[PDB]
Design an enzyme around this catalytic site. Sequence first.
Site, PDB file in Angstrom:
ATOM      1  N   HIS A 175      -1.543  -9.270  -0.653  1.00  0.00           N
ATOM      2  CA  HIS A 175      -0.878  -8.813  -1.922  1.00  0.00           C
ATOM      3  C   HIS A 175       0.416  -8.355  -1.352  1.00  0.00           C
ATOM      4  N   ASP A 204      -9.536  -3.182  -0.897  1.00  0.00           N
ATOM      5  CA  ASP A 204      -8.636  -3.815  -0.054  1.00  0.00           C
ATOM      6  C   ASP A 204      -9.208  -4.409   1.045  1.00  0.00           C
ATOM      7  N   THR A 209       0.915  -1.490  -0.108  1.00  0.00           N
ATOM      8  CA  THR A 209       0.059   0.190  -0.056  1.00  0.00           C
ATOM      9  C   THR A 209       0.687   1.070   0.136  1.00  0.00           C
ATOM     10  N   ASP A 265      -3.855   1.239  -6.319  1.00  0.00           N
ATOM     11  CA  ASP A 265      -2.468   0.895  -5.909  1.00  0.00           C
ATOM     12  C   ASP A 265      -1.840  -0.389  -5.987  1.00  0.00           C
ATOM     13  N   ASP A 278      22.709   0.135  -8.023  1.00  0.00           N
ATOM     14  CA  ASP A 278      21.706   1.490  -8.028  1.00  0.00           C
ATOM     15  C   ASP A 278      21.048   1.534  -9.371  1.00  0.00           C
ATOM     16  N   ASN A 313       5.543  -1.755   3.690  1.00  0.00           N
ATOM     17  CA  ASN A 313       4.413  -1.325   4.945  1.00  0.00           C
ATOM     18  C   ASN A 313       5.018  -1.296   6.086  1.00  0.00           C
TER      19      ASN A 313
HETATM   20  C1  LIG Z   1      14.927   7.374 -10.216  1.00  0.00           C
HETATM   21  O1  LIG Z   1      14.971   8.659 -10.152  1.00  0.00           O
HETATM   22  C2  LIG Z   1      15.852   9.367  -9.092  1.00  0.00           C
HETATM   23  C3  LIG Z   1      15.736  10.776  -9.183  1.00  0.00           C
HETATM   24  O2  LIG Z   1      15.852  11.346 -10.104  1.00  0.00           O
HETATM   25  C4  LIG Z   1      17.231   8.885  -9.259  1.00  0.00           C
HETATM   26  O3  LIG Z   1      17.779   9.240  -8.034  1.00  0.00           O
HETATM   27  C5  LIG Z   1      18.819  10.286  -8.141  1.00  0.00           C
HETATM   28  O4  LIG Z   1      20.304   9.791  -8.557  1.00  0.00           O
HETATM   29  C6  LIG Z   1      21.257  10.562  -8.175  1.00  0.00           C
HETATM   30  C7  LIG Z   1      22.474   9.768  -8.434  1.00  0.00           C
HETATM   31  O5  LIG Z   1      22.506   8.470  -7.293  1.00  0.00           O
HETATM   32  C8  LIG Z   1      21.376  11.322  -6.732  1.00  0.00           C
HETATM   33  O6  LIG Z   1      22.327  12.354  -7.098  1.00  0.00           O
HETATM   34  C9  LIG Z   1      23.150  12.535  -5.656  1.00  0.00           C
HETATM   35  O7  LIG Z   1      22.464  13.449  -4.981  1.00  0.00           O
HETATM   36  C10 LIG Z   1      23.221  13.555  -3.838  1.00  0.00           C
HETATM   37  C11 LIG Z   1      22.514  14.491  -2.788  1.00  0.00           C
HETATM   38  O8  LIG Z   1      21.291  13.603  -2.738  1.00  0.00           O
HETATM   39  C12 LIG Z   1      20.479  14.511  -1.721  1.00  0.00           C
HETATM   40  O9  LIG Z   1      19.544  15.774  -2.143  1.00  0.00           O
HETATM   41  C13 LIG Z   1      18.627  15.216  -3.085  1.00  0.00           C
HETATM   42  C14 LIG Z   1      18.000  16.483  -3.916  1.00  0.00           C
HETATM   43  O10 LIG Z   1      17.074  16.926  -3.065  1.00  0.00           O
HETATM   44  C15 LIG Z   1      16.594  18.501  -3.402  1.00  0.00           C
HETATM   45  O11 LIG Z   1      15.592  18.483  -4.466  1.00  0.00           O
HETATM   46  C16 LIG Z   1      15.467  19.958  -4.932  1.00  0.00           C
HETATM   47  C17 LIG Z   1      16.183  20.221  -6.246  1.00  0.00           C
HETATM   48  O12 LIG Z   1      16.168  21.463  -6.716  1.00  0.00           O
HETATM   49  C18 LIG Z   1      16.080  21.058  -3.896  1.00  0.00           C
HETATM   50  O13 LIG Z   1      15.243  22.289  -4.014  1.00  0.00           O
HETATM   51  C19 LIG Z   1      15.865  20.626  -2.416  1.00  0.00           C
HETATM   52  O14 LIG Z   1      16.383  21.656  -1.624  1.00  0.00           O
HETATM   53  C20 LIG Z   1      16.775  19.272  -2.181  1.00  0.00           C
HETATM   54  O15 LIG Z   1      17.917  19.294  -1.725  1.00  0.00           O
HETATM   55  C21 LIG Z   1      17.826  14.254  -2.626  1.00  0.00           C
HETATM   56  O16 LIG Z   1      16.875  13.628  -3.605  1.00  0.00           O
HETATM   57  C22 LIG Z   1      18.438  12.914  -1.941  1.00  0.00           C
HETATM   58  O17 LIG Z   1      17.612  12.014  -1.132  1.00  0.00           O
HETATM   59  C23 LIG Z   1      18.004  10.890  -0.947  1.00  0.00           C
HETATM   60  O18 LIG Z   1      18.326  10.878   0.298  1.00  0.00           O
HETATM   61  C24 LIG Z   1      17.494  11.007   1.245  1.00  0.00           C
HETATM   62  C25 LIG Z   1      18.235  10.647   2.514  1.00  0.00           C
HETATM   63  O19 LIG Z   1      19.617  11.583   2.653  1.00  0.00           O
HETATM   64  C26 LIG Z   1      16.365  10.066   1.257  1.00  0.00           C
HETATM   65  O20 LIG Z   1      15.362  10.627   2.142  1.00  0.00           O
HETATM   66  C27 LIG Z   1      15.902   9.946  -0.436  1.00  0.00           C
HETATM   67  O21 LIG Z   1      15.053   9.012  -0.426  1.00  0.00           O
HETATM   68  C28 LIG Z   1      16.964   9.828  -1.250  1.00  0.00           C
HETATM   69  O22 LIG Z   1      17.369   8.484  -1.011  1.00  0.00           O
HETATM   70  C29 LIG Z   1      17.782   7.915  -2.174  1.00  0.00           C
HETATM   71  O23 LIG Z   1      19.097   8.146  -2.903  1.00  0.00           O
HETATM   72  C30 LIG Z   1      20.018   8.149  -2.192  1.00  0.00           C
HETATM   73  C31 LIG Z   1      21.292   8.781  -3.021  1.00  0.00           C
HETATM   74  O24 LIG Z   1      21.128  10.288  -2.767  1.00  0.00           O
HETATM   75  C32 LIG Z   1      20.398   6.652  -1.964  1.00  0.00           C
HETATM   76  O25 LIG Z   1      21.709   6.522  -1.251  1.00  0.00           O
HETATM   77  C33 LIG Z   1      19.358   5.868  -1.198  1.00  0.00           C
HETATM   78  O26 LIG Z   1      19.540   4.626  -0.870  1.00  0.00           O
HETATM   79  C34 LIG Z   1      17.828   6.218  -1.906  1.00  0.00           C
HETATM   80  O27 LIG Z   1      17.977   5.548  -3.163  1.00  0.00           O
HETATM   81  C35 LIG Z   1      19.482  13.637  -0.925  1.00  0.00           C
HETATM   82  O28 LIG Z   1      18.733  14.135   0.328  1.00  0.00           O
HETATM   83  C36 LIG Z   1      24.623  14.345  -4.165  1.00  0.00           C
HETATM   84  O29 LIG Z   1      25.499  14.575  -3.261  1.00  0.00           O
HETATM   85  C37 LIG Z   1      25.284  13.310  -5.082  1.00  0.00           C
HETATM   86  O30 LIG Z   1      26.555  13.831  -5.688  1.00  0.00           O
HETATM   87  C38 LIG Z   1      27.761  12.926  -5.368  1.00  0.00           C
HETATM   88  O31 LIG Z   1      28.047  12.256  -6.690  1.00  0.00           O
HETATM   89  C39 LIG Z   1      28.359  13.141  -7.524  1.00  0.00           C
HETATM   90  C40 LIG Z   1      28.726  12.490  -8.965  1.00  0.00           C
HETATM   91  O32 LIG Z   1      29.311  13.179  -9.865  1.00  0.00           O
HETATM   92  C41 LIG Z   1      29.592  13.982  -7.389  1.00  0.00           C
HETATM   93  O33 LIG Z   1      29.675  15.129  -8.219  1.00  0.00           O
HETATM   94  C42 LIG Z   1      29.522  14.555  -5.753  1.00  0.00           C
HETATM   95  O34 LIG Z   1      30.680  15.153  -5.705  1.00  0.00           O
HETATM   96  C43 LIG Z   1      28.926  13.564  -4.932  1.00  0.00           C
HETATM   97  O35 LIG Z   1      30.083  12.886  -4.387  1.00  0.00           O
HETATM   98  C44 LIG Z   1      30.057  13.165  -3.014  1.00  0.00           C
HETATM   99  O36 LIG Z   1      29.616  12.192  -2.296  1.00  0.00           O
HETATM  100  C45 LIG Z   1      30.182  10.732  -2.407  1.00  0.00           C
HETATM  101  C46 LIG Z   1      29.165  10.068  -1.369  1.00  0.00           C
HETATM  102  O37 LIG Z   1      28.819  10.628  -0.006  1.00  0.00           O
HETATM  103  C47 LIG Z   1      31.572  10.941  -1.722  1.00  0.00           C
HETATM  104  O38 LIG Z   1      31.958   9.534  -1.779  1.00  0.00           O
HETATM  105  C48 LIG Z   1      32.291  11.722  -2.894  1.00  0.00           C
HETATM  106  O39 LIG Z   1      33.611  11.776  -2.246  1.00  0.00           O
HETATM  107  C49 LIG Z   1      31.887  13.112  -2.806  1.00  0.00           C
HETATM  108  O40 LIG Z   1      32.019  13.784  -1.695  1.00  0.00           O
HETATM  109  C50 LIG Z   1      24.435  13.075  -6.210  1.00  0.00           C
HETATM  110  O41 LIG Z   1      24.263  14.001  -7.052  1.00  0.00           O
HETATM  111  C51 LIG Z   1      19.928  11.896  -6.661  1.00  0.00           C
HETATM  112  O42 LIG Z   1      19.970  12.234  -5.122  1.00  0.00           O
HETATM  113  C52 LIG Z   1      18.790  10.660  -6.857  1.00  0.00           C
HETATM  114  N1  LIG Z   1      17.843  11.537  -6.162  1.00  0.00           N
HETATM  115  C53 LIG Z   1      16.743  10.470  -5.532  1.00  0.00           C
HETATM  116  C54 LIG Z   1      15.411  11.319  -5.273  1.00  0.00           C
HETATM  117  O43 LIG Z   1      16.965   9.485  -5.371  1.00  0.00           O
HETATM  118  C55 LIG Z   1      17.370   7.396  -9.775  1.00  0.00           C
HETATM  119  O44 LIG Z   1      18.730   6.994  -9.772  1.00  0.00           O
HETATM  120  C56 LIG Z   1      16.317   6.867 -10.652  1.00  0.00           C
HETATM  121  N2  LIG Z   1      16.646   5.440 -10.675  1.00  0.00           N
HETATM  122  C57 LIG Z   1      17.006   4.917 -11.805  1.00  0.00           C
HETATM  123  C58 LIG Z   1      17.329   3.370 -11.641  1.00  0.00           C
HETATM  124  O45 LIG Z   1      17.074   5.354 -13.095  1.00  0.00           O
HETATM  125 CA   LIG Z   2      25.862   1.425 -10.666  1.00  0.00          CA
HETATM  126 ZN   LIG Z   3      -4.013  -4.354   1.704  1.00  0.00          ZN
END
Ligand SMILES: *[C@@H]1O[C@H](CO)[C@@H](O[C@@H]2O[C@H](CO)[C@@H](O[C@@H]3O[C@H](CO[C@H]4O[C@H](CO[C@H]5O[C@H](CO)[C@@H](O)[C@H](O)[C@@H]5O)[C@@H](O)[C@H](O[C@H]5O[C@H](CO)[C@@H](O)[C@H](O)[C@@H]5O[C@H]5O[C@H](CO)[C@@H](O)[C@H](O)[C@@H]5O)[C@@H]4O)[C@@H](O)[C@H](O[C@H]4O[C@H](CO)[C@@H](O)[C@H](O)[C@@H]4O[C@H]4O[C@H](CO)[C@@H](O)[C@H](O)[C@@H]4O)[C@@H]3O)[C@H](O)[C@H]2NC(C)=O)[C@H](O)[C@H]1NC(C)=O
Ligand SMILES: [Ca+2]
Ligand SMILES: [Zn+2]
EC number: 3.1.4.39
Length: 803
Positions: free
Chosen positions: A417, A259, A157, A306, A684, A178
């Site tokens: 489900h 449901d 859900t 859903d 990923d 869930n």
């Molecule tokens: C499906 O679609 C989605 C969405 O498009 C795809 O997912 C995206 O994929 C990107 C690549 O993985 C990823 O880019 C990251 O982002 C990092 C920061 O992420 C945080 O902020 C995100 C943005 O929110 C903002 O939204 C608007 C935008 O205008 C703003 O106005 C707001 O103010 C917000 O700030 C946010 O989405 C993200 O949320 C995740 O984490 C939260 C908890 O912290 C969770 O609540 C949430 O559910 C998300 O969790 C998911 O994603 C994370 C990864 O982010 C994952 O681990 C979880 O399991 C889960 O899956 C965050 O809050 C940014 O820092 C990254 O940059 C690094 O890599 C780049 C590569 O070049 C470097 O340039 C950069 O330097 C940096 O590396 C540094 O950090 C490394 C690790 O710490 C370190 O090793 C290195 O040395 C460096 O220091 C990168 O850009 C997107 O975040 C992600 N978006 C979402 C929503 O998930 C997805 O891929 C698609 N799927 C498929 C299969 O196609």
């Molecule tokens: Ca990969």
């Molecule tokens: Zn149900």
Amino acid sequence: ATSGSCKGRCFELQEVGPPDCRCDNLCKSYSSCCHDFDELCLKTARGWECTKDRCGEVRNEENACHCSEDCLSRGDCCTNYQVVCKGESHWVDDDCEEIKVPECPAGFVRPPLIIFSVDGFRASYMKKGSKVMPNIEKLRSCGTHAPYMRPVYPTKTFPNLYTLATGLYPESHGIVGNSMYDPVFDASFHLRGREKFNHRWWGGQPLWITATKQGVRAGTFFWSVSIPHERRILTILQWLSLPDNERPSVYAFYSEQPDFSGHKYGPFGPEMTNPLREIDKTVGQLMDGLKQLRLHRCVNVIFVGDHGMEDVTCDRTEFLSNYLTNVDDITLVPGTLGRIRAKSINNSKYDPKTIIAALTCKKPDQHFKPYMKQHLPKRLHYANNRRIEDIHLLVDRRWHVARKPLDVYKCFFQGDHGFDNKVNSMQTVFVGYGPTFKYRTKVPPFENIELYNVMCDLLGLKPAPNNGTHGSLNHLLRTNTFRPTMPDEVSRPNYPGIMYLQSEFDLGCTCDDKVENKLEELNKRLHTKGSTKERHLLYGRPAVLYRTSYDILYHTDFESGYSEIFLMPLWTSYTISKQAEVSSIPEHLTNCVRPDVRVSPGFSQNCLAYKNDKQMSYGFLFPPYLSSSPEAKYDAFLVTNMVPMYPAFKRVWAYFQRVLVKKYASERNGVNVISGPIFDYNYDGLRDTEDEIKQYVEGSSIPVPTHYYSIITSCLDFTQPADKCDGPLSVSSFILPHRPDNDESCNSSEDESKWVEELMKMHTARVRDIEHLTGLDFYRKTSRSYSEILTLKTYLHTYESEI
Ligand SMILES: *[C@@H]1O[C@H](CO)[C@@H](O[C@@H]2O[C@H](CO)[C@@H](O[C@@H]3O[C@H](CO[C@H]4O[C@H](CO[C@H]5O[C@H](CO)[C@@H](O)[C@H](O)[C@@H]5O)[C@@H](O)[C@H](O[C@H]5O[C@H](CO)[C@@H](O)[C@H](O)[C@@H]5O[C@H]5O[C@H](CO)[C@@H](O)[C@H](O)[C@@H]5O)[C@@H]4O)[C@@H](O)[C@H](O[C@H]4O[C@H](CO)[C@@H](O)[C@H](O)[C@@H]4O[C@H]4O[C@H](CO)[C@@H](O)[C@H](O)[C@@H]4O)[C@@H]3O)[C@H](O)[C@H]2NC(C)=O)[C@H](O)[C@H]1NC(C)=O
Ligand SMILES: [Ca+2]
Ligand SMILES: [Zn+2]
Ligand SMILES: CS(=O)(=O)c1cc(Cl)cc(COC(=O)N2CC[C@@H]3CN(C(=O)c4ccc5[nH]nnc5c4)C[C@@H]3CC2)c1
Ligand SMILES: [Cl-]
Ligand SMILES: [Cl-]
Ligand SMILES: [Cl-]
Ligand code: NA
């Protein structure tokens, strides 16, 4: 301090936090309602329908709704007011009239959007309950509908409702079940309790936040269970009567049925007719209400589910205590899926390899299969989140999994489900009705992750980044807001000629190829220059969408894009006509591998690494078995056609190549095949950069793929051969995990004809999934519209029986 009042604040739209008491439709869940909330906001007097006597009555403010003359102005008539008192008709009774343009009242800047979501509404209810659902059937046949809509995994859900709102896979939005445990929060998310209210669980950006951030006002999307459906409709209708500057543009209604009953009585229990009746009456009330407000040819309505519902009973439960001796050292998230982790999070004694081994093929009719999460079918997109346990159990439809018999007995349910999202009983519904949706149009089944883009479009919003493919559902809409465009190629290919002599190579490779004209030498020359390329590359070269160095290599029977970084093709393309013949690798060519004179020794693989790596063998992307001639077969043995393969995997691959390709060519009248490696070590769902590869052929720079893909395209009209197709295309794809054992396949000790195809079907995939994982863009050059190509790329061949 719940000391204040709700007087003139009933269902206010801006949530005011404590100490001051709330009067919004979520105050109940937060236990923060004003003491007069039920009294003022939850009136029930005289029910929900007008009677002939109540017509023209004098207004009594204690009624649930009104039949007085002033009710239309006040915006609070019973939805059947005009029918009973003004001789109007119910909306369902009117004929279906095309809504060519929005017909909205003055002050309406855009057609409002109403999302009517129904919990556990299985796709097949549309046909099987049609007799008792007249309002829903009218929406369905007058508007735009799909035969079914595919939910996300797990078919639960919360993950599905939130996916609808965000266009994201659960692994990205964070709601992966869930119930879930987050090891960093050290906290559990449950349906009951306050934890679920904390914002830290909810990632991504849901439609209501997207709307708000761009100046579009939203009604609430969540409804307390104690607010009756009639009151939910009236509140939405009231909100629609607000002044221009206060009125939301997007609304949501939620139904706990079918449901709720479905779990108790099973999907088709005789007790199921009544909830279907009742959902329908509610839809009728909404539509009658809109027809009163003159909005029924102005509002876009989405009727969406859903997930579906399956027959599941207590007796169909597998218990882990039957497989494991040490059942107390694990925690299981049980039910229609299984997730296992250590009972104590920091103990080195816990070995997940031994847990899996003990769960693998132990009973002949075992009703679940264990996976490391990275080994789950890529189409499920269920791995990239810390809330997803390393061990996963995919449970058979109709079945449950539990830890011990006591968890289950200390049977009250017939439906559940949560299963694999390709399962027929899990499929759910989509209908779109309104000025922006198409008129009397059936569209093919699609995934629910695509809807967020459409809802943004319907509202004039720019969608946050999401997992939909924007443009793939434009064919649902009468007027599009978004024009999709092909992404620009980032890296252009090299086209290398013959530049190296054999003796420049020290690959440790040998071959029996020293036997051999004006006609056949100028002809093989054209093959290496691209003469048969119109036959083997049917839809243009895939575009490389990242920065890299690669060569286009032409051959008689196939063409490839060879990566000098990864030392192997990113893609290999070839056409097998229906009349094509399978041959064998001749005895003297069994260990044949030949240097490719167009590619330097420095950017080539070597046979020595494979000799020294006792774990790793090799295979070929273009299959020797499908060579057009003995002379051409030598091309198949080029070092540039070679890729690393575990011996366990070669069994799968050789069977696909030797047997299945020819079979598909027979059945589909030729097929075009594009095959290649996938590297996804951090699971990923996206292509790994070169410095993320965790495994190489021993002592070499040859990276080992995690997966191998193929995209198999032919003509939709199979009377035309794949290579001469005038119309729409037909595709099926797969992403096979590259595993050193076949533990996944319980019958793998038998002949490949008994298990390989079954494995491939399980790992079916969308072209779009392969694009994410390779950074390639396919179908760049066809005679088809780009929107139709986007739809094609999101297609999944599920292999289920007909719905
Ligand atoms: C499906 O679609 C989605 C969405 O498009 C795809 O997912 C995206 O994929 C990107 C690549 O993985 C990823 O880019 C990251 O982002 C990092 C920061 O992420 C945080 O902020 C995100 C943005 O929110 C903002 O939204 C608007 C935008 O205008 C703003 O106005 C707001 O103010 C917000 O700030 C946010 O989405 C993200 O949320 C995740 O984490 C939260 C908890 O912290 C969770 O609540 C949430 O559910 C998300 O969790 C998911 O994603 C994370 C990864 O982010 C994952 O681990 C979880 O399991 C889960 O899956 C965050 O809050 C940014 O820092 C990254 O940059 C690094 O890599 C780049 C590569 O070049 C470097 O340039 C950069 O330097 C940096 O590396 C540094 O950090 C490394 C690790 O710490 C370190 O090793 C290195 O040395 C460096 O220091 C990168 O850009 C997107 O975040 C992600 N978006 C979402 C929503 O998930 C997805 O891929 C698609 N799927 C498929 C299969 O196609
Ligand atoms: Ca990969
Ligand atoms: Zn149900
Ligand atoms: C589709 S939409 O309009 O974008 C949209 C998105 C979101 Cl996140 C929520 C919405 C609308 O949600 C709401 O009003 N909610 C309030 C009720 C909640 C309490 N629930 C259960 O206890 C429950 C139901 C069925 C089950 N089967 N198995 N276990 C189950 C447990 C369901 C929850 C749904 C959310 C709509
Ligand atoms: Cl094997
Ligand atoms: Cl790279
Ligand atoms: Cl069905
Ligand atoms: Na080897």
